[PDB]
Write a structure and sequence with these properties.
The structure is cut from a larger assembly and holds chains A, B, C, D and E. Chain A is mainly alpha-helical. Chain A is built from seven helices and one strand, in the order H-E-H-H-H-H-H-H. The longest helix of chain A has 16 residues. Chain A is globular. Chain B is mostly beta strands. Chain B is about 10% helix and about 55% strand. Chain B has one helix and 14 strands. In chain B, strands 1, 2, 3, 4 and 5 form a five-stranded antiparallel β-sheet that branches. Chain B has a five-stranded mixed barrel with strand order 6-7-8-13-12. In chain B, strands 9-10-11 form a three-stranded antiparallel β-sheet, with no helix packed on it. Chain C is elongated and about 55 Å long. Chain C contains six helices and two strands. In chain C, about 50% of the residues lie in helices and about 5% in strands. A two-stranded antiparallel ribbon of chain C has the order 1-2. The chains are: A mainly alpha, B mainly beta, C mainly alpha, D alpha+beta, E alpha+beta. Chains in contact: A-B, B-C, B-D, B-E, C-D. Chains A and B meet through strand 1, helix 2, helix 3, helix 5 and helix 6 of A and strand 1, helix 1, strand 3 and strand 6 of B. Bound molecules: zinc ion (3 copies). Chain D: It is found in: Nucleus. Chain D: Recruits TFIIH to the initiation complex and stimulates the RNA polymerase II C-terminal domain kinase and DNA-dependent ATPase activities of TFIIH. Both TFIIH and TFIIE are required for promoter clearance by RNA polymerase.
Chain lengths: ~130, ~170, ~150, ~90, ~80
């Protein structure tokens, strides 16, 4: 019925737009500030905090421009939003790893194009 | 994968909240009701970005409560089988590893751990390490796992992980 | 189709040629009826040989000879080495000299352990990966395309 | 063959964890539900008692022995069939 | 706009509106009108109705499946 390795998803999640942990981190930090501002309002949930902690720890991009560049760059490529989300969220270092991690990635682009895209993403990444 | 989607939800506003600040109360109540909850259809919903629309408030006969159908843009997470995801190991046992993925919890069975790994219970933090000691998997670590399957129960979602594939485990 | 089949499920093979045998590093004939059991226990262990498989490692093949299956799999791997073209050698013996040991390695690897084979392959890889493998990769892929065309 | 294939598929789907009180076997998918961190071990919700797993090797091995011999003994009929397909 | 039903509140509408509004007040809903010494939620609902200040809209379903949302403040009360 559903299989990410086969890119099979329900219409509810196929028509939807994918978000990166760097993007979710920025949004959660924004929601945090939005919750920190106007004090004495409802406190944030443990799920939000757990997701924030998790998304921050695995956040591959720490700057607004790096997140926007990655998104705007990948949107130009003729790749599916799931493929692009997996690629930018997992950040595979090489084309072989990308094909290994995403068995559906094969055939969409040549090794040189695939590696060039990954190389750009690897250069745009923020390392701690 | 995380997603941004418009969701349908119905708020049963109690009459005490009618009158002024009605819609303001519905907004506040929506965030409180949906944020931090999970549904098998859309997964866990982390935060509400905006509310698309507030429908007509139908007064429930006899109940007095008014039912407000709401359309709102929110961010959600749902794990799909045959997917690789980053995880943090929470507990390490001889039968398997318990891990967390944001709001989701994943269990990795021993049979899904690579043959090169071996459990080192004598270590202070219980961990699995390679024969050549090149990598070690323990509690509170950076790992990647393949979702073999996803489960939903008690308004919660939990997946099955595997580390047999390459580029998995400690990262 | 003509062969009996897997040591366990030797019955559907007689029915139709649409079902194909699967080859593995262990050089053992396997198929879904048997493969499903290999995942419930061991998760990638040969039934009779017990040898573990790093992954599924299943590939479609239509050869009844398991030695050819292994030899082809080995051949395909070894062709990445020693495959420098004829212009590299001035003497007629050299054109087939390395092919002798290569064919010995390929053949011997079907039965003997790869300990010395991998060592020799690695000891030559350290030298051939620099230039000749880089050059022969281009020429091999080019001539392969010429063979396809 | 379809029944044997069904029995083989069953041998692959058989539950691994089990409860000694109610004699119920649970699939490894329930492992996260059966494992209680307060106890540090697997337990049964109905029996509030320990759930075992290591015995799961027995059904996997045993079933293969019965199912495999079926093809070994039917060989005369298969040969006679191959000889009579015309 | 484009309303065809009668502008008068039917006896049935008056009954349900008062019952529904009385129930909301009993459930401590805020009250629309200046009440004086009143405690019976049903008596308060009638005062709100006399003043035409009940905060309710009647969705009159037409036989063709269409409907007309008439505010209680728009209908002529039959009392
Ligand atoms: Zn073998
Ligand atoms: Zn077999
Ligand atoms: Zn029990």
């Amino acid at each position: 019925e559903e299989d990410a390795s086969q890119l099979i998803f329900p219409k509810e999640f196929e028509t939807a737009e994918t978000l990166l942990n760097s993007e979710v981190h920025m949004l959660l930090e924004h929601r945090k500030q939005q919750n920190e501002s106007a004090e004495d309002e409802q406190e944030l949930s443990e799920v939000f905090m757990k997701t924030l902690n998790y998304t921050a720890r695995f956040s591959r991009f720490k700057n607004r421009e790096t997140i926007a560049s990655v998104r705007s760059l990948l949107l130009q490529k003729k790749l599916h939003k799931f493929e692009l989300a997996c690629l930018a969220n997992l950040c595979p270092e090489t084309a072989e790893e990308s094909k290994a991690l995403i068995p559906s990635l094969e055939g969409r682009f040549e090794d040189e194009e695939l590696q060039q895209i990954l190389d750009d993403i690897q250069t745009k990444r923020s390392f701690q | 994968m995380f997603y941004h989607i418009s969701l349908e939800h119905e708020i049963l506003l109690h009459p005490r909240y009618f009158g002024p600040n009605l819609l303001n109360t519905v907004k506040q109540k929506l965030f409180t009701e949906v944020e931090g909850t999970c549904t098998g259809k859309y997964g866990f919903v982390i935060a509400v970005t905006t509310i698309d629309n507030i429908g007509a408030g139908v007064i429930q006969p006899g109940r007095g409560f008014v039912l407000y159908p709401v359309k709102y843009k929110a961010i959600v997470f749902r794990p799909f089988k045959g997917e690789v995801v980053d995880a943090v190991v929470t507990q390490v046992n001889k039968v398997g590893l318990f891990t967390e993925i944001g709001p989701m919890s994943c269990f990795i069975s021993r049979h899904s751990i690579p043959s090169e790994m071996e459990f080192d219970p004598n270590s202070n933090p219980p961990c699995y390490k390679t024969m050549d000691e090149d990598i070690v998997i323990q509690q509170d670590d950076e790992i990647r796992l393949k979702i073999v399957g996803t489960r939903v129960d008690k308004n919660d979602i939990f997946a099955i992980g595997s580390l047999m594939d390459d580029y998995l485990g400690l990262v | 189709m003509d062969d009996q089949g897997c040591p366990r499920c030797k019955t559907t093979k007689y029915r139709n040629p649409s079902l194909k045998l699967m080859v593995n590093v262990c050089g053992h004939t396997l198929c879904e009826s048997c493969v499903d059991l290999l995942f419930v226990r061991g998760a990638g262990n040969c039934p009779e040989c017990g040898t573990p498989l790093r992954k599924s490692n299943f590939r479609v093949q239509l050869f009844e000879d398991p030695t050819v299956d292994k030899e082809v799999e080995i051949r395909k791997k070894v062709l990445k080495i020693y495959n420098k073209r004829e212009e590299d050698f001035p003497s007629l013996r050299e054109y087939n000299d390395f092919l002798e040991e290569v064919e010995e390695i390929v053949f011997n690897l079907t039965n003997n352990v790869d300990l010395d084979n991998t060592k020799k392959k690695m000891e030559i890889y350290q030298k051939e990966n620099k230039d000749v493998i880089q050059k022969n990769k281009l020429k091999l892929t080019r001539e392969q395309e010429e063979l396809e065309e | 063959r379809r029944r044997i294939e069904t029995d083989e598929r069953d041998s692959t789907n058989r539950a691994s964890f089990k409860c000694p009180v109610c004699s119920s076997t649970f699939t490894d998918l329930e492992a996260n539900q059966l494992f209680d961190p307060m106890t540090g071990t697997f337990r049964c919700t109905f029996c509030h008692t320990e759930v075992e797993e290591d015995e799961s090797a027995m059904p996997k091995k045993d079933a293969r022995t019965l199912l495999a011999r079926f093809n070994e003994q039917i060989e005369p009929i298969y040969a006679l069939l191959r000889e009579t397909e015309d | 706009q484009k309303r065809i039903t009668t502008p008068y509140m039917t006896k049935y509408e008056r009954a349900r509106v008062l019952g529904t509004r009385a129930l909301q007040i009993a459930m401590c809903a805020p009250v629309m009108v200046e009440l004086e010494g009143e405690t019976d939620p049903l008596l308060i609902a009638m005062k709100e109705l006399k003043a035409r200040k009940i905060p309710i809209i009647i969705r009159r379903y037409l036989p063709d499946g269409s409907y007309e949302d008439w505010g209680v403040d728009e209908l002529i009360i039959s009392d």
